[model samples]
Target: RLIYTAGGYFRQSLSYLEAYNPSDGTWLRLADLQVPRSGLAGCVVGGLLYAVGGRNNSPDGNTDSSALDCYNPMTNQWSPCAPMSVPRNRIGVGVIDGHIYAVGGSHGCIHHNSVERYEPERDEWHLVAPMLTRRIGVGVAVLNRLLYAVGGFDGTNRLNSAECYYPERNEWRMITAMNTIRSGAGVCVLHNCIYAAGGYDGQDQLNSVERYDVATATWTFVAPMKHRRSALGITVHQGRIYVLGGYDGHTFLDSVECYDPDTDTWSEVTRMTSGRSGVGVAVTMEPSR
Candidate 1:
């Protein structure tokens, strides 16, 4: 398997598609996104890669996009799927029980608490339970049949607040909040714990990391990343958490870091060819030749 990173904000929004090969620590170019965008998110479900909603720039200027694009490895191409009901930027994406979930995001002055689920078989999106707080740049991941939505900015504040959705109940309930606010943080499930990595905490881009224990309903700090980052792309690949490019308060980043839960340490890896912020990363089966 390889790590795939798609569109994000650099000089402007990007349509670039690149993949990192963990074995040799190298990168390879893949198909570009059909639409150039940033503030989007990525997820893998049913063995396919889906680039979810984000903001798209047009002749009229930047606008939120409801567009959903799916990538097929077999053909090395991308195609459109059903769009989300509401256009969203900085959307959080996760997959649960064979379905894709689009979490909170924002457009213009409105931040959203609305959530939607995508049915691949039918190529349809149905509105589902909304979160308790509206969020943009939220962190989302699936753990033990529950979809955890972590820190993000509400319309007014950066949040340390955390919550999860119980699919069967169609409900979202608050969980123990992280120690610090983490809007734009990177989140993913690794080794039975949900890890929340670097992001802006109202004041600065952070290098700190934390994990939540579902059984104990607690969040505890873990080893921090080597570089401060926000709007970074993150995913679990081959048992380690891969934290990719984002902005550090001042500049865009091309660096990549990996966290080893067994050792509880962060180590630098090969960097992307170019710096990126608000990038999207997903782990999918290696492209078949």
Candidate 2:
């Protein structure tokens, strides 16, 4: 279940949807998002993929949305789910204990500090404790049952702040910030550490990469990616990190890159059928039983 969402479009926000199979290296068409949008947040829970709030094609992304939808690969069907409490774009998502956590994002150029959680079992979204800082384009990953929200923009400047939510206590606490101020980077959790890749740092679309040490609560530079990317899709597969399509400030990219923590190097892999950015990717090796 390699799911993709609305992405770089020349005109109206795109409703086109495609699914990639890392196994066969083939992409198949699927039901489009009910509303075309980009910079949305997504995650999988019990093999179900949820697409959350993002912006549509409009001036200043004023068409920001809070819509939530679910997709089932086995049935190839799309269904409307409970919408978010508020509209958002460029949000981050984390799943822990079967609940989907929607992190901060922009509500029409206003960076957000709020967090919300969705329970499929109850079919509802409830507001969680707000984040330490308002942010958009943040990186979200779950490690050790905590949902970590990494660097992003806070409407004034690109942010370097980091925080994590302790679900057990229902509180968010500040953590070690990243070395670089970034928004739009991709993040993945593997081997208990969080890896954050390229993003726009207010000036340059960066190729820099960093990983957070859970035990040490610090970040260190690692091998950079092959290309500068923002709003890309990244995931850990069999312990390696894969960064997918993104824009390099000029062109929408379709190329994919892989990072090896063992060698600390990056290499270009394959690409999607078309060049597009501001999308999401999910991986599944087998059907849910």
Candidate 3:
């Protein structure tokens, strides 16, 4: 299932959860979030969807939140679970073996370095290892047996800094940086390699994209998107990367596009019925039984 939830870029915090149908190429509004919160991030865990650390959207963002919501598609229920230790927004979410990791987001006018993980079986979150970099809006993924942390702003400059956390070794080591600094970017793993797409680079809203070759530990440029966006949503389906709603500095965008890794190209796809900026999206690659 292709899932999109909560558009918080504007005044009213959006709570409607949307799912896209590939067969019909249409988006249907499904369950609305229970709290009517936005500016949150989500992931699929054990065949369910989970969201964390949300606040109302604003120029500096509203005070960060620590609420966590779990969604089960079968029942269309948005259930509240554990709350995070700290309030934050613009954070990165990653899941490995049913454990959800929240890393590097903003809270109370400053960026958070603390990281936490939630074990669904326990319905609780514990502060795990913190990320080395103080960043907001970085891309995160489970790549190469470590939690890969991508680019973001660090109060000074747009960062290309990259790092990874290894579970077995219980350590973090700096990885290769991206070709360009990126914040409010999206990250997804396809075919064992990781890709970082459109985001703001401090000076510009970027349409450029890059992919990491896990074996080589290097970042390579790829075909750019048709639109430049920041604070966007990205997910994988049918082997393609879908880039969804985002802001382009001037106005909110309803435009959407898909990138075919095999062809190394991007094609314009369906647009939302109305423009809503920075709507979070998730795609379930599991067999739709």
Candidate 4:
């Protein structure tokens, strides 16, 4: 299995694309993004890696990217897809019902609570029900066919609130909020629970981790990470929850760690080649020739 990380913040937008092999503990550099971006989000659909919207830095000023791009392993290339109607930076992405959903990001000075979904077959994006709060650097994941948007900056404050969208009814509903007001946290579903990992809490980078139980509608604190992190890339790999590079208040971090649900513990793993923050991460099958 392979975990691919691309496009992030490290003083400026980064175009580097790299993959780590868990089996061999090796890393490989891959083709870079056409446009350097930060705060982008990534997801895999039908074996294709989709890199969603983020900010592109320029000499004039920063411009938010509306572009949607996909990488095909067969070709080892990245290609542009239909762009989102509104440019988004610090966006959150998830795949559900055969479509990719981009939710809660901002463009320039403006923040957005709007949501959109991309249809790969049609190559078009359509507006969906928006969330309650305008969230930048939000963490998104899918559980029970519903998309969950958690903790992010809401312009005025770091958010602890969370909400989920029900596609069947085309509606948004409040869920149990997180225990900590975490912006730039990493979220994913594993072992039938939604996990919210390290992030910033306005004053400091956080190491606290929490999980939501859909059945009970409650969030409980779990083990904390060894290092504080925010704007990290997180995903499930071979049943363990792995968190990659992020900012730790003092400096950019290349440290990697994983959490085992069975053990209810956190352990430091191998580190990334370079430090990164606001990175987009997605896992897919090993490249096939």
Best by lDDT: 1
Mark the regions of model 2 whose C-alpha exceeds 4 Å error after superposition. Answer: 1-12, 58-62, 285-289
TM-score of 3: 0.93
Candidate 4's residue-wise lDDT over 1-289, tens digit each? 6999989988888998888887788887888999998899989999999999999875567889999999987677999999998999999999998899999899887788999999999999999988988999899989989999999998999999999999999998989899899999999999788999989998999999999999999999999998999999999998999999899988889988999888989988788898988889999866655
Tens-place lDDT per residue, model 2, 21-54, is 5668776777777778788866788777777887
TM-score of each: 0.98, 0.93, 0.93, 0.97
Candidate 4 whole-model C-alpha lDDT, 0 to 1: 0.91
Query: Cα deviation of 7 in candidate 4 (Å)?
Result: 0.8
Q: In terms of lDDT, which candidate is stronger, 1 or 4?
A: 1
Using TM-score as the measure, the top candidate is 1
Residue-level lDDT of model 1, residues 1-289, one tens digit each, is 8899999988788998888999998787889999899999998887789999988765558988888999987789999999999998999999988899999999788899999999999999999989999999999989988999999999899999999999999999999999989999999999899999999988899999999998898899999999999999999998999999999988899999999998999999888999999888899987767
Model 1 spans > 4 angstroms off:
58-60
| CA lDDT of every candidate | 0.92, 0.81, 0.78, 0.91
Query: Residue 40 in model 3: shift from native, Å?
Result: 1.7
Give candidate 2's total backbone clashes: 0
Q: What residue pairs clash in candidate 2, if any at all?
A: none
Candidate 3, residues 169-195, lDDT tens digits: the string is: 656689999898899887888887889
In model 3, how large is the Cα lDDT of residue 154? 74
